[PDB]
RNA sequence: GCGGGGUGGAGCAGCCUGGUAGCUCGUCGGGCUCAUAACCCGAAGGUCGUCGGUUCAAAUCCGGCCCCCGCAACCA
RNA sequence: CUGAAACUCAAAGGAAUUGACGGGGGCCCGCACAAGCGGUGGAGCAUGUGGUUUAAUUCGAAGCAACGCGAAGAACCUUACCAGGCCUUGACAUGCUAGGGAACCCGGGUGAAAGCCUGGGGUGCCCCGCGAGGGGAGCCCUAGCACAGGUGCUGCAUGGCCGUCGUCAGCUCGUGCCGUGAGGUGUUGGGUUAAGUCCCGCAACGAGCGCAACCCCCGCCGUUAGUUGCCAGCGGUUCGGCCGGGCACUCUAACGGGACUGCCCGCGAAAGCGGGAGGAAGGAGGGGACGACGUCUGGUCAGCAUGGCCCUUACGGCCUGGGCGACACACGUGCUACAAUGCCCACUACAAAGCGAUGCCACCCGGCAACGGGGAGCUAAUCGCAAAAAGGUGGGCCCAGUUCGGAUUGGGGUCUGCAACCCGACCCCAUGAAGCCGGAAUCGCUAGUAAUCGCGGAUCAGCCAUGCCGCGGUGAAUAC
């Protein structure tokens, strides 16, 4: 169960309860942030690259 | 108390309301 | 494995994002995802040209994509040709005002993503991985650069025991934030598997 | 529980089978995947085969066991103890 | 033929003087150790070889049978 | 004393080199011990794990550095496991052959759904088009070929990313010198520091990766700006900065200043060390970001990438149900407690960081209540979440397995969701368990810390969150 799952994830379901988020970049089902559409792994990867607008490391 | 739902301190713990903690 | 990514470490000081635009909570993802779809298509075609930096700007249903490259001619085409055939391809995905520029790279040897990309190529062509790295650094330094370091990990020469080999010259103060470090990564496919190439170029400090 | 203001839930397709048979007079066998259902007064005296994930479990319904769910009568786990 | 004996898994107490089963090791659960041993903390398990009898009550007293140790079996 | 052989091994050795280790030495350091303060180990419960059980209880993680870990949200979904029902260029990409018509929307039979069978309805272009009619190709359908697809194996073939020793003071290089050579030298030596920190010395002289600095938060002051924020003054004031009026003050958020052993006494060859002053701040100001060469053939083929090996009417795929939530037991991390420095009720204070347009929801009403029906404001320094809570005042309880403790269950309801049987949270009536301070053993913390108190956020329909990431309130003891 992989590619059929990232694909099953976008199509509108048999009931609206079954909506689950899949990381639009790599397809990770777990830890998917609404704001970016990404998983915490990709989150960090794009960010570190500087391809995430306004995003920078927090230091306090 | 903090585990006892039927009290003030108890519902503050859960973060809910009722007769034993009114809003 | 310990070290920090030296690009993301410098954001807002010595290095600037490759996506400069604003959006609210309800729109951010949809635009960001387009930059993702765009950058792939661009680097799918423009890999040949010697792609260095993909800048994207936005306002409202319109976007200027500033592309940096070592062979501007292969990007622009025959008299305005290739750069055109992409504009249509571009606004096909975008569905909006696709303003696609092409900018000069005043030395691929001072471009980290280029230095790496070339080494990743040389070892796809069955070349001596040790020697090739010392050369990669030797180019960068001859172009006046302040310091250089280059790293390849993987089954070098096909070796069964994977190995990490590296080389360096000058300064590379990766702990220093007021110092400019251009970093580029290049992933080399082969028959025996994939090797990874890391390049760090110390231009000079601020 | 199931919110009293709403309905008393039975999967549409099974309710009909009971009611069809009520006319004709019951009862054959009823292979079902309706654990989410409620046992309902029209069902008394029937013999329903409930799927517990594995088998179709024969349950004779009575006048006493009405308000419950079906799956409470089709056990999902086999347990004989330890040692 | 005479004397002694059988009690948790091993080896010994308790029997004489009836009511109450104990000691060391071992087993099991926990701890220290990277880990094992040792060591430390808790805990299980004998219905007393059997069948009979005395008694209010029998591991204990008395009888039967069974198995074990020791000694005897001489003039011939 | 003289003194073999058979057999047997692929070495037995000598000195020196670099390491590692020592129940060797020396000098140092780390909440390492000690000094303290609060716990864990017992109990009830939440969660993770080992076992066992199971049709299946998917998988990885394994001593410090696995165990509220991947999992920042398991009822279906997720989901990789099992039972049953099904699909064959296929849930998906890029190509060609030909058939329909392109496309798209609406319902029907059947069945748990999937699927299998079905009944509808009109194609642009550019074209011979007043005409039967014809295709190109935006696209869907259909019989094939390519090829798809695999969370199947291998982290002992790999990239990437991370843990780790370790924020430890270290790791090397160029040249010269030394040695046959491994290598040494420098980097050792005196002193000093948080530090290979700086000084002094020297066959060494410099260079590099580390330390430190540069960056963020906080503590003082300033410039700039004055609404939605603030109100010192005056005037109105329905008695609310509500109106006039102002940016002074609090603040908001950008740019600066300031701290450097700079001054003084002194000890010092020096670097520095003790003390003194000025100053909001003193000797790295508090915290953060940041982790050298390498080690662990460390972790992750299950986030992704990837060689290779393996499957092809199936190790791929679609669904309905179940399992991941089992329970003779063992362990890890936790929550709530055993009470009077406490429990309970009423009235009454003072935070911060965040969050919010089928979202937060003021206020009004129905309800014991969860909630339900109204309904205003707010793309938010405006409106909301919102009460902060420990605290303060008053009153009750009176040492009791209790007005301590809130598990277990019975009964009744609200909500989210297609659906709460397995298997959600919440409210109410009743039930009121263990537990009287914890065996051997064992953990954390050096100051705005520990302890205690509440608040938010990510994930997210709801939620098993007592977890995690933050935020403020109160606020210690002790280091010979
Ligand atoms: Mg994949
Ligand atoms: Mg969901
Ligand atoms: Mg998700
Ligand atoms: Mg109580
Ligand atoms: Mg308390
Ligand atoms: Mg081959
Ligand atoms: Mg014995
Ligand atoms: Mg005796
Ligand atoms: Mg006696
Ligand atoms: Mg034991
Ligand atoms: Mg042991
Ligand atoms: Mg008698
Ligand atoms: Mg007796
Ligand atoms: Mg007897
Ligand atoms: Mg007797
Ligand atoms: Mg006898
Ligand atoms: Mg004899
Ligand atoms: Mg001699
Ligand atoms: Mg030797
Ligand atoms: Mg400690
Ligand atoms: Mg101590
Ligand atoms: Mg103690
Ligand atoms: Mg305890
Ligand atoms: Mg416990
Ligand atoms: Mg298990
Ligand atoms: Mg695996
Ligand atoms: Mg080990
Ligand atoms: Mg969860
Ligand atoms: Mg399930
Ligand atoms: Mg299912
Ligand atoms: Mg499913
Ligand atoms: Mg499931
Ligand atoms: Mg490895
Ligand atoms: Mg492994
Ligand atoms: Mg690796
Ligand atoms: Mg040398
Ligand atoms: Mg020598
Ligand atoms: Mg020489
Ligand atoms: Mg040398
Ligand atoms: Mg050294
Ligand atoms: Mg040395
Ligand atoms: Mg020294
Ligand atoms: Mg240090
Ligand atoms: Mg230095
Ligand atoms: Mg020297
Ligand atoms: Mg001013
Ligand atoms: Mg000093
Ligand atoms: Mg630093
Ligand atoms: Mg390994
Ligand atoms: Mg993989
Ligand atoms: Mg692979
Ligand atoms: Mg689980
Ligand atoms: Mg225990
Ligand atoms: Mg807990
Ligand atoms: Mg505990
Ligand atoms: Mg009681
Ligand atoms: Mg449920
Ligand atoms: Mg009570
Ligand atoms: Mg008791
Ligand atoms: Mg008491
Ligand atoms: Mg206590
Ligand atoms: Mg205690
Ligand atoms: Mg002790
Ligand atoms: Mg400390
Ligand atoms: Mg939220
Ligand atoms: Mg929530
Ligand atoms: Mg639960
Ligand atoms: Mg909370
Ligand atoms: Zn991702």
Curated annotation (Swiss-Prot), chain A:
One Pfam family, short name: Ribosomal_S14
- Describe how the cofactor binds: Binds 1 zinc ion per subunit.
Q: Which GO terms describe its cellular component?
A: cytoplasm; small ribosomal subunit
Membrane-crossing residue ranges in chain numbering: none
Read off the InterPro entries from this record.
Ribosomal_uS14, Ribosomal_uS14_bact, Ribosomal_uS14_CS, Ribosomal_uS14_sf
UniProt GO MF annotations? rRNA binding; structural constituent of ribosome; zinc ion binding
Tell me the first and last residues of the signal peptide.
none
GO BP terms: namely: translation
Q: Does the keyword Nucleus apply?
A: no
The organism's place on the tree of life at top rank: Bacteria
* Residue numbers binding Zn(2+): 23, 26, 39, 42
- Annotated keywords: Metal-binding, Ribonucleoprotein, Ribosomal protein, RNA-binding, rRNA-binding, Zinc
Cofactor(s) required, per the database record: Zn(2+)
> NCBIfam families given for it?
PRK08061.1 (NF005974)
Q: What is the protein's quaternary organization?
A: Part of the 30S ribosomal subunit. Forms a tight complex with proteins S3 and S10, which cover it.
Q: What does this protein do?
A: Required for the assembly of 30S particles and may also be responsible for determining the conformation of the 16S rRNA at the A site. Binds 16S rRNA in center of the 30S subunit head.
Family per similarity comment: Belongs to the universal ribosomal protein uS14 family. Zinc-binding uS14 subfamily.
The identity of this protein, by name, is Small ribosomal subunit protein uS14
Q: Provide the species name.
A: Thermus thermophilus (strain ATCC 27634 / DSM 579 / HB8)
Give the organism's phylogenetic lineage.
Answer: Bacteria, Thermotogati, Deinococcota, Deinococci, Thermales
Question: Which gene codes for it?
Answer: rpsZ
Curated annotation (Swiss-Prot), chain B:
Q: Name one GO molecular function term.
A: rRNA binding
Any one cellular component term from GO for this entry?
Answer: ribosome
Q: Please give the residue ranges the record annotates as the region Disordered.
A: 1-23
Q: Name the InterPro entries for this protein.
A: Ribosomal_bTHX, Ribosomal_bTHX/bTHXc/bTHXm
- Basic residues: compositionally biased ranges: 1-12
Q: Which UniProt keywords apply?
A: Ribonucleoprotein, Ribosomal protein, RNA-binding, rRNA-binding
User: What is the protein's given name?
Assistant: Small ribosomal subunit protein bTHX
Q: Tell me the gene name.
A: rpsU
Q: Which residues form a coiled coil?
A: none
What is the superkingdom listed in this entry's lineage?
Answer: Bacteria
Which family, according to UniProt?
Belongs to the bacterial ribosomal protein bTHX family.
What the protein does comes down to:
Binds at the top of the head of the 30S subunit. It stabilizes a number of different RNA elements and thus is important for subunit structure.
NCBIfam families named in the record: PRK14753.1, ribo_THX
Its assembly, as annotated, is: Part of the 30S ribosomal subunit.
Swiss-Prot record, chain C:
KH type-2 domain residues: 38-106
Q: Which key words are in the record?
A: Ribonucleoprotein, Ribosomal protein, RNA-binding, rRNA-binding
- GO terms classed as biological process: translation
Recorded hits in InterPro entries, A to Z, give:
KH_dom (IPR004087), KH_dom-like_a/b (IPR015946), KH_dom_type_2 (IPR004044), KH_sf_prok-type (IPR009019), Ribosomal_S3_C_sf (IPR036419), Ribosomal_uS3_bac-typ (IPR005704), Ribosomal_uS3_C (IPR001351), Ribosomal_uS3_CS (IPR018280)
Q: Which GO terms describe its molecular function?
A: mRNA binding; rRNA binding; structural constituent of ribosome
Q: Name the NCBIfam families on file.
A: rpsC_bact
Q: How does it assemble?
A: Part of the 30S ribosomal subunit. Forms a tight complex with proteins S10 and S14.
Main function: Binds the lower part of the 30S subunit head. Binds mRNA in the 70S ribosome, positioning it for translation.
As for family, the record states: Belongs to the universal ribosomal protein uS3 family.
Identify this protein by name: Small ribosomal subunit protein uS3
Q: Which gene encodes it?
A: rpsC
From Swiss-Prot, chain D:
Task: Write out the GO cellular component annotations.
Answer: cytoplasm; small ribosomal subunit
Disulphide bridges? none
Q: Which GO terms describe its molecular function?
A: rRNA binding; structural constituent of ribosome
Which Pfam families does its entry note? Ribosomal_S19
Q: Name one GO biological process term.
A: translation
Against PANTHER family, the record matches this protein to: RIBOSOMAL PROTEIN S19P FAMILY MEMBER (PTHR11880), SMALL RIBOSOMAL SUBUNIT PROTEIN US19M (PTHR11880:SF8)
What does the subunit comment say? Part of the 30S ribosomal subunit. Forms a loose dimer with protein S13.
Name recorded for this polypeptide? Small ribosomal subunit protein uS19
> Which gene specifies this protein's sequence?
rpsS
């Amino acid at each position: 169960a992989r590619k059929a799952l990232i694909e099953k994830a976008k199509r509108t379901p048999k009931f609206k309860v079954r909506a689950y988020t899949r990381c639009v970049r790599c397809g990770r089902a777990r830890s998917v942030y609404r704001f970016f559409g990404l998983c915490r792994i990709c989150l960090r990867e794009l960010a570190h690259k500087g391809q995430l607008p306004g995003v920078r490391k927090a230091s306090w | 108390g903090k585990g006892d739902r039927r009290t003030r301190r108890g519902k503050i713990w859960r973060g809910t309301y009722g007769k034993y903690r009114p809003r | 494995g310990n070290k920090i990514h030296p690009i993301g470490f410098r954001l807002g000081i010595t290095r600037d994002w490759e996506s400069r635009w604003y959006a609210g909570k309800k729109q951010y993802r949809h635009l960001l995802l387009e930059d993702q779809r765009i950058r792939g298509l661009l680097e799918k075609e423009l890999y040949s040209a010697g792609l260095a930096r993909v800048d994207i700007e936005r306002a409202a249903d319109n976007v200027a994509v500033t592309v940096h490259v070592a062979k501007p001619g292969v990007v622009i085409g025959r008299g305005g040709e290739r750069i055109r055939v992409l504009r249509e391809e571009l606004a096909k995905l975008t569905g909006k005002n696709v303003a696609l520029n092409v900018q000069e790279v005043q030395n691929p040897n001072l471009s980290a993503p280029l230095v790496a990309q070339r080494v990743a190529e040389q070892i796809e062509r069955r070349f001596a991985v040790r020697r090739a790295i010392k050369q990669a650094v030797q180019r960068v330094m001859e172009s006046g650069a302040k310091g250089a370091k280059v790293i390849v990990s993987g089954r070098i020469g096909g070796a069964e025991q994977a190995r990490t080999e590296w080389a360096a010259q000058g300064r590379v103060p990766l702990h220093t934030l007021r110092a400019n470090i251009d970093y580029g990564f290049a992933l080399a496919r082969t028959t025996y598997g994939v090797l990874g190439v890391k390049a760090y170029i110390f231009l000079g400090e601020v | 529980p199931r919110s009293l203001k709403k309905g008393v839930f039975v999967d549409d397709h099974l309710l009909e089978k009971v009611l069809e048979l009520n006319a004709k007079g019951e009862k054959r066998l009823i292979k079902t995947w309706s654990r989410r259902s409620t046992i309902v007064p029209e069902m008394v005296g029937h013999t329903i085969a409930v799927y517990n994930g594995k088998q179709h479990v024969p349950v004779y319904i009575t006048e006493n066991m009405v308000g419950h769910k079906l799956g409470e009568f089709a056990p999902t786990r086999t347990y004989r103890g330890h040692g």
